Design a protein around this ligand. Structure first.
Ligand SMILES: [Mg+2]
Ligand SMILES: [Mg+2]
Ligand SMILES: [Mg+2]
Ligand SMILES: [Mg+2]
Ligand SMILES: [Mg+2]
Ligand SMILES: [Mg+2]
Ligand SMILES: [Mg+2]
Ligand SMILES: [Mg+2]
Ligand SMILES: [Mg+2]
Ligand SMILES: [Mg+2]
Ligand SMILES: [Mg+2]
Ligand SMILES: [Mg+2]
Ligand SMILES: [Mg+2]
Ligand SMILES: [Mg+2]
Ligand SMILES: [Mg+2]
Ligand SMILES: [Mg+2]
Ligand SMILES: [Mg+2]
Ligand SMILES: [Mg+2]
Ligand SMILES: [Mg+2]
Ligand SMILES: [Mg+2]
Ligand SMILES: [Mg+2]
Ligand SMILES: [Mg+2]
Ligand SMILES: [Mg+2]
Ligand SMILES: [Mg+2]
Ligand SMILES: [Mg+2]
Ligand SMILES: [Mg+2]
Ligand SMILES: [Mg+2]
Ligand SMILES: [Mg+2]
Ligand SMILES: [Mg+2]
Ligand SMILES: [Mg+2]
Ligand SMILES: [Mg+2]
Ligand SMILES: [Mg+2]
Ligand SMILES: [Mg+2]
Ligand SMILES: [Mg+2]
Ligand SMILES: [Mg+2]
Ligand SMILES: [Mg+2]
Ligand SMILES: [Mg+2]
Ligand SMILES: [Mg+2]
Ligand SMILES: [Mg+2]
Ligand SMILES: [Mg+2]
Ligand SMILES: [Mg+2]
Ligand SMILES: [Mg+2]
Ligand SMILES: [Mg+2]
Ligand SMILES: [Mg+2]
Ligand SMILES: [Mg+2]
Ligand SMILES: [Mg+2]
Ligand SMILES: [Mg+2]
Ligand SMILES: [Mg+2]
Ligand SMILES: [Mg+2]
Ligand SMILES: [Mg+2]
Ligand SMILES: [Mg+2]
Ligand SMILES: [Mg+2]
Ligand SMILES: [Mg+2]
Ligand SMILES: [Mg+2]
Ligand SMILES: [Mg+2]
Ligand SMILES: [Mg+2]
Ligand SMILES: [Mg+2]
Ligand SMILES: [Mg+2]
Ligand SMILES: [Mg+2]
Ligand SMILES: [Mg+2]
Ligand SMILES: [Mg+2]
Ligand SMILES: [Mg+2]
Ligand SMILES: [Mg+2]
Ligand SMILES: [Mg+2]
Ligand SMILES: [Mg+2]
Ligand SMILES: [Mg+2]
Ligand SMILES: [Mg+2]
Ligand SMILES: [Mg+2]
Ligand SMILES: [Mg+2]
Ligand SMILES: [Mg+2]
Ligand SMILES: [Mg+2]
Ligand SMILES: [Mg+2]
Ligand SMILES: [Mg+2]
Ligand SMILES: [Mg+2]
Ligand SMILES: [Mg+2]
Ligand SMILES: [Mg+2]
Ligand SMILES: [Mg+2]
Ligand SMILES: [Mg+2]
Ligand SMILES: [Mg+2]
Ligand SMILES: [Mg+2]
Length: 115
RNA sequence: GCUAAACCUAGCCCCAAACCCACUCCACCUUACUACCAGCAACCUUAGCCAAACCAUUUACAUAAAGUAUAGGCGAUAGAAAUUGUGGCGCAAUAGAUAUAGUACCGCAAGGGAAAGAUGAAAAAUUAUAACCAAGCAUAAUAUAGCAAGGACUAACCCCUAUACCUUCUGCAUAAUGAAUUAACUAGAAAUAACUUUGCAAGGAGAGCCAAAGCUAAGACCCCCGAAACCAGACGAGCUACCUAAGAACAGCUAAGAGCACACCCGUCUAUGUAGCAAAAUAGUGGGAAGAUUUAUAGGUAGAGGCGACAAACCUACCGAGCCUGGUGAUAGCUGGUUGUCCAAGAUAGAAUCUUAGUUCAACUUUAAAUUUGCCCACAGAACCAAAUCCCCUUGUAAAUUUAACUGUUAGUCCAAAGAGGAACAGCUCUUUGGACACUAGGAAAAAACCUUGUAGAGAGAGUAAAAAAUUUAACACCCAUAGUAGGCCUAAAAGCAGCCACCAAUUAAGAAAGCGUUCAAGCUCAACACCAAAAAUCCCAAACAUAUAACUGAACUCCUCACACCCAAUUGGACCAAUCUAUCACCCUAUAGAAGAACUAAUGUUAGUAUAAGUAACAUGAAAACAUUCUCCUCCGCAUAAGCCUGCGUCAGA
RNA sequence: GCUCAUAAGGAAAGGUUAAAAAAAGUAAAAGGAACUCGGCAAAUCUUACCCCGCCUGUUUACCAAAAACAUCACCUCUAGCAUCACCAGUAUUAGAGGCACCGCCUGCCCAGUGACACAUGUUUAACGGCCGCGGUUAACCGUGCAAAGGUAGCAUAAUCACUUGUUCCUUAAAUAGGGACCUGUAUGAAUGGCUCCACGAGGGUUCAGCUGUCUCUUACUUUUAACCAGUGAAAUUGACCUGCCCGUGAAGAGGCGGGCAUAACACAGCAAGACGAGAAGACCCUAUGGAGCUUUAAUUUAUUAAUGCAAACAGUAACCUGCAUUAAAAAUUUCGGUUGGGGCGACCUCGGAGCAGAACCCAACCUCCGAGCAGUACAUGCUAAGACUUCACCAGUCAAAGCGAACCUCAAUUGAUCCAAUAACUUGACCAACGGAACAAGUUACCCUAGGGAUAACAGCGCAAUCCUAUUCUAGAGUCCAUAUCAACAAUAGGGUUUACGACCUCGAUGUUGGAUCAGGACAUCCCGAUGGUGCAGCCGCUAUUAAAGGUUCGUUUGUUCAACGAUUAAAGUCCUACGUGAUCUGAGUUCAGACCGGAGUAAUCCAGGUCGGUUUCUAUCUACUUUAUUCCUCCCUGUACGAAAGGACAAGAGAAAUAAGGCCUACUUCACAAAGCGCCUUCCCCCGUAAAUGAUAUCAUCUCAACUUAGAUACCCACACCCAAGAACAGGGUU
RNA sequence: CUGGCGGUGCUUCAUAUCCCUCUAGAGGAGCCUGUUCUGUAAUCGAUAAACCCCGAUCAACCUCACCACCUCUUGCUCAGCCUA
RNA sequence: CCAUGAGGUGGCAAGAAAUGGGCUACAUUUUCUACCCCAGAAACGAUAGCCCUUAUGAAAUAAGGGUCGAAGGUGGAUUUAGCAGUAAACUAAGAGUAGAGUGCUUAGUUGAACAGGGCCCUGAAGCGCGUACACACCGCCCGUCACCCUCCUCAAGUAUACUUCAAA
């Protein structure tokens, strides 16, 4: 027995727990993490921030909603521009975005005093 | 009825209170119980087990301050002061002091250690109580068969049923340990904190301690036996190893640490013995037997040591270092056990750990309480390199979150599918989804895991779920033969089959040839025409019928009369209760509260008697006789003494 | 100290019979070691060899008595001296060591350790070592390195498999014994190499004699056994009203599912089972439980002696005490985890790919890819709503804003407490055994203890990777000729007999192989019986089926079944029986303590290396048991049938020999009023596998898984008391 | 006994000789010149005094009698023979 | 014996590998110029190609005429002859090549040292010693392992033949 005992070590990693934390229809508050995962899964949509680990987190109190909108990234990403140019005429990427439909308003004009 | 069973009084533990004893007569440090004569003696840090999962520094010897400061491989732990101020809710011969006594017994020695008895006013009462109560036997031996029991039965057996208990482990009669019963003893002491009920309240408690509803007081919770092994000093050279002083022994024969051979020293081998003669024996063959020889007496060498012709052998039957005392009831992830009745809830994804036989967290489970949403939920929502899964309103329901507690689980096995390595094998090792087993019920033969089925009782009632293996392949249409010829290439040769070509066509109507056999041709058929699966070793294993009408039998499942808390491992929450003492009327034996040395089918548990092999193994005493005496055999044995014992086969009376 | 057998000293037989088994003695018809690993009890009394040890002597009282231990002889080192020994001694004297007398010898090396301050070197008779690559079965060439590179010598060793060596004998067989070869690659010199005078309870062979060890055992006495009288234990027991076969069953059933059986107890033997009975298996494994031994493992020098300093006095311009070093040997401790049993090999932290395919999720002694970092600012600044969170915790990740300036990329890429530096921001780990004791090794076959078949060596159990047996298409051979016969590439069925594989009860015990008596069963049949084919002119042969009623040798070696060989008969078959049977036996060794040979190891110890020897218990309780024809040789068949000659048979009858069983002492022996064999008599029935009349499905033909015919139980029996050929008692026969 | 030989002894000579002194050149590169011969169809004889600036006083062919290609029996020679 | 011969075109004349010799020049009077012996400076070598192939010719090796006008670096033992027209320098004709240079025969000019001492190396002559040598030191030669091989001695246990028996 040599060269085939257990030289292929290293595979002893636990689960990273990276998925969806607030499914669609849930009343998420401002600041809660919506999901965490590697590689841009759900691109940022309306009222959805992005941290450093390519994660998402709600910014306003509302219900989470997912749609399929066209993808038009920033010209900075030369790789994205190249991939787009490599597509034919009638071609669309259609990525998965995330939205947060706001419920409450930003404020209300209340009566202070009668002068 | 033999053997048995009980008596309870002597004495023990606690403190409550004082501080105790001690030479008539001789004798006692030499060899202790010895009338008598010329020689140093004293003061010493205790170690160690154990806990930090090892272990070195470390670990204990009135109240409050305060378990604070402080010290501490700053971790396990240790831890001050100033200030303060004359009886038993005991024991009653396996209990109580070990005690009738520190008695024999082990013993040369330190050292360890038990029981004696049972009526009373008269035992200078003759004369016995009332038999009854466990274990072993008699009155009284068995009469097909099989966990010693049930339904029964008019009856014992005969009929059907069911695989001893506890512990472990996923799984049990298993052939895994425990066990002969009986009587006695024998194994959960409490903690910061938490729950319930009393009393007062922003205060209570009989200074001190706690206060954004708190404190006080009570009730309720933390097992036993079991090593190897260390420390300090005693006791041990009377046997073994060595040394010292003075003594003893060694026939004879042949002839010098010479040879054979008495006594004598040790035992290389056989046989018997193996609970024997002996916790190391009996005969010869064995080596020596004027010398490194054996031994009588006394003294010296004692464990971190002594000794040692090294056997790492011996030092009082067991020496890789003898026993005792006090630390040690040492420790121990480990074997074993952990006592009365009944009801209810009650099976776990994983991680860390000098770690996978152990511990913590998480998760499962239990108790009391405040809150409201817990599960299948429907459109929809949830990725570029198949069964599926998450959220999910109405809808079935009544379950879920949290607070405060704390023990218990955290080694699993099998089945259907995805698999992973192995041989697309293993009652093979490990995951994912579901079920079962650890929990009873009816079957597949005896089955854990397979099919059906759960809320617990009776009735000599009714209706159902699962439920009984089937099946025998081999013929065959079997009438019948001219020729252009030996076509051509190679083949001396294959002409019809060593090899290739086209494969025509005359027979009236069909192969330049589909097989067989020829070196080669010779011969025999055919295409077509004319009726035509079993075998392995103790002996195969339920009797058994193909022919009376499809439906029966078949549970702890459902129903019928009553009332229902009365079928889980570990754990948890509750209702009762045999015995004793205490305070209460009782008083032919019971109630309210206070306590547990409070409740035995087991811990190769201890004490006492008794079954079991078992009347089996072991065993002796030479013969006749007038018990005067005589006869047969053996002898390396016998005489006195140093070592050692203390009256230990003579008489008198009874055993 | 005495005569050691006599003037001393004692009674081996409680009484009857002599069942079975064992032991102590007497003899034995032919052999004298041929059963046996061994000449191991009893008798002769004895001849020649090898290894080792100088010979005597001692060792493990209590399993190993030696090939070990010690020295008369040689050699190494230390000591210049007197009052307790060493010493009332003095260098030829003593102390500490290596080897083994005597003879031939002790060849080389201080790189490394130790001892000598020897002015830098000595010491190997101290610890230890004496080499490799290509060549006309090798000298000598080309060389590399150090200390030399095994010199002499001995040889298949007590010397790692090769090993049962080669080689010639010793016998009928020789892994037993011995004459020579280095090739012993790991022999080889006072860790001593070789011969030899005497010797060995040391370990292995052998020539002429020897015995019951066996061939084949028998008769007698005693011990001893049974009954009648007495007393009188222990190991052990859950209760037993206790059978057998098939299958299951925590995996070998007297109590389970189905069948066979079963009147009651008692003695006389039994050791197959009740995984039988005595010891918390001694072999394997766990223990942050121990102890012995060894140092260059982690620590302290308590103690001894010498060193430098201090006080301590004499000199000038000599004893104690305290502080650190050195050698000795002393004082405490440990020897981490995984391993489909333990060591060995490998691993110990983290990220990704498939298992885990569509929220998360899960296993690495399953197959892979990577990292203890890498590049520019230093607003990588100070604050703070809400969340994710490697399935716990400790540890990690995103973030609206608020103040201050604007007009980071990557995937793991790491480090907790205490402690230390630091005036103070801040920093300190290959703690990788990476959730991390502040630093600790090797062995135990001299081991102890608490436990484990959670976890091993033998079994049982399940698989069938390996093998064997049969069949299927023929590939290929077999002179034409696949299928008389052999048989590739594959598939279908049976095996658990070999090697493993899994550890499911059996480590508070299942005693391990051969060899002895005894054998039970199965046929994949070696032979005796019957058939078909054949490369069958006959025997000798080959193949396929039935038949297990029977038989299945004598010996030489190595402990080994297996393993080689000599002669037989027709054959010297396989397999299971817990590698059948140790409560029937055996010890040869396999698990032990001591020693030797070569090696590993600085040392203790070990080679799963080789041998010298190594206490084998049981008093029976239960179940169960304890009395009924086989072959070979010979004679008429004889030289027959068969050819080309050699060669050479079928059946039947008869004589004799053995096998196993049933009997006897009158001849022969052991011997005597008996019994036994070596001596003598008897032993008898076919076995299902084939070949044939007669005809249909299938008017042919045709043996019948269509109808019908051929080779196709006899034996023993069932009316008190004395002796016995009957018997342990009981029972039986005779008693004119 | 003759001779050879001697790092063999003694004595006498060497007059560019053997040294004690002195001259131009080889021991530095290119053309010509040779040799053993790898190219080849290609003489190569001597290959240390006795052989190479020897046929060389010269290798476009003539030197070259060596083969790629053709030649002949009277072979200009009563041949060539440079084939040993 | 119908060539192993020679005759008709072609060729070898570059160095696998080793190398002597003739010329070019390795520098300060090298290379340049005047006085026909009145001085200095940079401190110089087409060595071969290409055509006319010169010298000829069927066909061209140092070339007379058009392209290298530079680059090499007096070297260590040893070596050649030279006692004076010698060593060393400065110029021409030509045997022979049809064909020629830097070679060779002849014809010319300038012109050293020491010209003295010894066998230490070498050669010769006279006396003499030794000789295992004689195709004569390039000799004989001694001892290391042996095939076709010729023999012997020792050797523990073995097999065969043989003397002694009775002279007791
Ligand atoms: Mg992975
Ligand atoms: Mg403790
Ligand atoms: Mg501790
Ligand atoms: Mg005070
Ligand atoms: Mg008492
Ligand atoms: Mg008491
Ligand atoms: Mg009774
Ligand atoms: Mg019963
Ligand atoms: Mg229990
Ligand atoms: Mg238990
Ligand atoms: Mg288990
Ligand atoms: Mg049992
Ligand atoms: Mg409150
Ligand atoms: Mg003594
Ligand atoms: Mg002794
Ligand atoms: Mg012996
Ligand atoms: Mg015994
Ligand atoms: Mg002796
Ligand atoms: Mg003697
Ligand atoms: Mg004597
Ligand atoms: Mg002790
Ligand atoms: Mg304890
Ligand atoms: Mg542990
Ligand atoms: Mg147990
Ligand atoms: Mg109890
Ligand atoms: Mg329940
Ligand atoms: Mg750790
Ligand atoms: Mg398993
Ligand atoms: Mg269960
Ligand atoms: Mg019900
Ligand atoms: Mg009791
Ligand atoms: Mg027991
Ligand atoms: Mg008990
Ligand atoms: Mg008995
Ligand atoms: Mg007697
Ligand atoms: Mg008797
Ligand atoms: Mg005889
Ligand atoms: Mg005999
Ligand atoms: Mg035998
Ligand atoms: Mg034998
Ligand atoms: Mg023998
Ligand atoms: Mg003899
Ligand atoms: Mg000796
Ligand atoms: Mg012993
Ligand atoms: Mg002995
Ligand atoms: Mg000695
Ligand atoms: Mg001596
Ligand atoms: Mg030596
Ligand atoms: Mg060997
Ligand atoms: Mg008896
Ligand atoms: Mg009796
Ligand atoms: Mg017992
Ligand atoms: Mg069974
Ligand atoms: Mg049983
Ligand atoms: Mg047992
Ligand atoms: Mg045990
Ligand atoms: Mg301990
Ligand atoms: Mg300990
Ligand atoms: Mg392990
Ligand atoms: Mg978490
Ligand atoms: Mg902002
Ligand atoms: Mg971690
Ligand atoms: Mg660490
Ligand atoms: Mg540690
Ligand atoms: Mg040993
Ligand atoms: Mg096994
Ligand atoms: Mg063929
Ligand atoms: Mg197991
Ligand atoms: Mg075991
Ligand atoms: Mg055990
Ligand atoms: Mg047992
Ligand atoms: Mg058969
Ligand atoms: Mg066996
Ligand atoms: Mg047995
Ligand atoms: Mg020893
Ligand atoms: Mg030796
Ligand atoms: Mg026995
Ligand atoms: Mg009996
Ligand atoms: Mg009985
Ligand atoms: Mg010629």
């Amino acid at each position: 027995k040599s060269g085939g005992s257990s030289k292929n070590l290293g595979g002893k990693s636990s689960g990273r727990r990276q998925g969806i934390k607030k499914m669609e229809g849930h009343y998420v508050h401002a600041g809660n993490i919506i999901a965490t995962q590697r590689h841009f899964r759900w691109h940022p949509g309306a009222h959805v921030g992005v941290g450093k680990n390519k994660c998402l987190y709600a910014l306003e109190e509302g219900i989470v909603r997912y749609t399929k909108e066209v993808y038009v990234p920033h010209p900075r990403n030369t790789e994205a521009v190249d991939l787009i140019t490599r597509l034919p005429k009638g071609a669309v990427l259609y990525k998965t975005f995330v939205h947060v439909v706001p419920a409450k308003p930003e404020g209300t004009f209340k009566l202070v005093a009668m002068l």
